[model samples]
Target: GAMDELLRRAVPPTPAYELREKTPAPAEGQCADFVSFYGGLAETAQRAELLGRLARGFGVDHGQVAEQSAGVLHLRQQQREAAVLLQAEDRLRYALVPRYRGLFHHISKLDGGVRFLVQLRADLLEAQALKLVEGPDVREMNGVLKGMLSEWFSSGFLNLERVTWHSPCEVLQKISEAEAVHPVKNWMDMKRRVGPYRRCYFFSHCSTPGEPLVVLHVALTGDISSNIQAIVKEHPPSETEEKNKITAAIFYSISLTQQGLQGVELGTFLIKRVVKELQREFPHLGVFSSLSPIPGFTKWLLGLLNSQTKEHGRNELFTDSECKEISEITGGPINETLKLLLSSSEWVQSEKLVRALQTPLMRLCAWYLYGEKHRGYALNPVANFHLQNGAVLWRINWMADVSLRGITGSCGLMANYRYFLEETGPNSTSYLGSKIIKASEQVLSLVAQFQKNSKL
Candidate 1:
């Protein structure tokens, strides 16, 4: 009953003083009341129930949409005044506007409202993931709010703030916590990361000052880095000095602080801004590339391997000769040995097995990067992101990531998505509009190798 009242009390659109001065928001107290009540719910169960009710009841007034849309159609058929048609369409837009957004609107009028809604949207996502509530209503409500958040959190509203070893302790701690690609190990390790030859910049909402929504970590290098271990682990003292030449900027990791903003375009913003900022700071910098990890590569490979093994009674993933060599090295059958050993990083120790597996594995890995598609787009999430930004599938580095994650998850594979600055526009248009991926000659050859050699 209380929940219904708060949402029902959502405000009517304050008619924009015929397009000039505005009326003040009615009551900050009511918004505060809702916030405290929401916080007081305590259990996730209660929160989900409240959210379900909100989603179900407080969406668009569809009856108004039906009538307004009919009016607009009637005008479209008539030789009506353009102004009249514009007004009718505007009315339809207003009717299509959901009611719950107004509840969000009023709440955000409070000083702390932005922060509250950020957490609120995050919990909404958490509940959605848990199947706490499910239906078209909740889904549409989520979509509407995401669009609203997108407008508010657009590039203009985000400030790119840099981080260094000297960046405040609180800031550094949050950076460490928000790190997703590579977890920050200790103060000393984190210190070296921001010390020199590295650039750490995060996007903070103008409303929520100092809060990092996403962080972009870039390495200043002579060339694109092949190994992740080298980027995250090793640090030579010489590079710490300013004398070292920096020609390429390797965008190694982009970690998110908020999962709620998952699909929103933050990386592109960070990448463009960082590239611009770097170009200004280091005029000699010519290359901009992403040294990305293939998270789903192993998962997809294993799934395919498992299916082929059980379904076909053979591992056709590896060539016949490759299988023979692998079998000879382990004394076990190639199929089971590859499966069992590769399930961990132990396979890396066997030199013969490693060498035998390389050719086929690299070919298949190349296919996974360049050939796999999701409705004409890259199947890998990270790949799709860079591809969408017009980054070419330039190279895939074998034995690129040797850490447990790099070894097991990616099969020690890392990819380089290079930005050919002038070609990005045409490339992005080609990729997005025509579903044509622009890749380097090396990547294209690897795909060719897989096509020639692969059985299925």
Candidate 2:
């Protein structure tokens, strides 16, 4: 009953509120009540029930929409003047605005409202995942909140804070916990990442101070991908000792702390912002590159290799000669052995299998990054993200990271995305508009090798 009162007070069109001299809309206290009360309900079912009711009860007036839309069509059919037609459509658009929009807008104005809604949306997603909540109404509610969040979060200028060894202990702990890319957890690892040579940076918003929207690692290294251990333990040569120490800004790892910001392009903005920051600090830092773990490459490989029955004896993934070689080494068919040996960490120790897998894997990897297309772009999710961001496929490093996660997901392959300072725009258009993949001689050569060998 209280929630009903709160919802009624928080929303509008209720005759009871008309008699009151107070502001026609909900006040700050009203929003705060909704926020606090909603948070106090710890049970998932409780939250789900409330949200389902909220979404279903407080939404767009379809009657209003139907009337407005029909009027809009009526004007369009009559050959109405341009100005008159525009007014009708505008009313239709406003009519489509759900009643919950006002509630969310009020909550966002309160301090930390953005943060609360983020958590709320994440809870909604969790409910959906657990099947506690269902239907288009809940989906629409989440969509509305997400869209509003995107506009608010990015519209307010994002403060870029350089993470340092002296950063607050809580910040350090959160960064370690949010290390989604490389999973760096140790204290030493945390310190090393923010050390002199390796720099850690994050983006924060006006509403959520000290809250890192996304974290990015920019390391000063000439090497392709400093082994994760090297990143954690090995110190780089000082600027005085080595003049070429910090020429390239290698973005090795990046992570988003909040799940609610999933679809927002905030991480993309962080990368662009970091590039400018690096340029201002180091005038000579011309080279910008990223060593990304191509997530899903190994999984894709496994999917193909597991379906050995697709073809008689071999799949396009492995060459006939290579399959024979692998089959000989494992005493089973190539398809069966390839999945068995490569799926686990044991593949790393077998030098013969490694040697046999080297050529085919390298060539196939190049194909995966360059040739494989999703709607005429890169297929690998990681590759797709970078390519769309105006990066060139510079190089691919085999066995770059032997960590079980990397080995399992990426097949121990790391791809370099080089952002040629001025060419970023043209490169992006090339990949996105021309349906071309801007890659290096090394990558193209490997792709060429793949095409030369395979019929597919």
Candidate 3:
């Protein structure tokens, strides 16, 4: 009844007057009530409308903010005492806070409340995508929501659990749906993921029991795996002596299930925790790396090919001889030939075409990963994620992922992002601090080769 009353006051075709009255500095119980009322909205469109209403109606009072800012400026201009300026500054800061934030903060503490906030943000994101949220206010509110979630969902609050076949069927189903990188074919496939040479771990928040924020599938072997097929094989390597044989742990697939937790650092925390767990289990284990997909490479390469061809100059992407070889193999201009072949998986059937394409594709991939920059960081999202986590670009493999997605998305290329335990701290510092990408000499050499080809 209390929640229903709050709902009556909070959600409407008309904005909530009582919500506004309580917003400036609401009592704890009142804040929780508002949280409950908003959290329980069953209809998607109604939730969107309420979110927009809250964002626009509960935003900072610009009129009040201007008055406080003027007072602070006057204090500064008059060379007033520190206490006077500080008081004005405090007022200005208080005025800057949007009213929805108090309700959000309170919601995070309710039972299963963090989970509710996550879903709420997901709704906000969807509404924003559909252009349902009007103006800057709603988007700003979404940012504030994301900021609060990042703080609440930090690594300290996450519990690391090794997901096994013995785990609940519901969790197994969730993992099945959440496996974006590689689909689990059947129960047998699922078993292998948590079986002998393989390990599956997920990060779960204390508030959301049995709900995985993120899942990581790993394969243990003697060396860094270059291919996804090997990692996800139905008939995996023999289980006998699997533990003692492991020299490297390859994190092949990591999937984030909660769309609302997109910006949270859950995956990063999961990887670091897995590294520690693996190290503790196998003291002899040394190498830690990811056999990750270059999801954007083919798209980037296609765009570059189109642009370069339109300019109608000597092709910079491929060597002159390599172009000649590609032309012979595919029977067209280098760029045109590449465009046609890469548009479909038909090219993989030809041995000559695959070989001819290797040098250029690998070199271009190196450039894409190492040379490209987005706001002074790695351009590719997956690459940026690993580099930011202190993993160095170790190696690039051709035909590493030969699935339909692999062929179309990345031209069957995958990369190894190797993590060095001793270097992670400094590497992370350098990457975050100055946008420096740490890479092995092999990777760097590929970039250098690309640059050399650029001159020719």
Q: TM-scores, in order shown? A: 0.90, 0.86, 0.87
lDDT string for model 1 (74-120, tens) is 98898799989999898888777787776787777787887787778
In candidate 3, how many Å is residue 424 off? 1.5
Q: What is the clash count for each candidate, in the order shown?
A: 0, 0, 0
**Per-residue CA lDDT of candidate 2, range 252-370, in tens?**
88787888777556244666778888778777777788888888898778877765334777776777787778888888866677778777768888788877888888898998888
Off by over 4 Å in 3: 1-8, 11-49, 71-88, 234-242, 310-314
Number of the top TM-score candidate: 1
lDDT of each: 0.80, 0.78, 0.80
Error of 2 at 240 (Å): 6.8
Better of 1 and 3 by TM-score: 1
Ranking by lDDT: 1, 3, 2
Which pairs, if any, clash in model 3?
none
Evaluate model 3: give its lDDT: 0.80
C-alpha positional error of residue 450 in candidate 1 after TM-score superposition, expressed in Å: 1.8
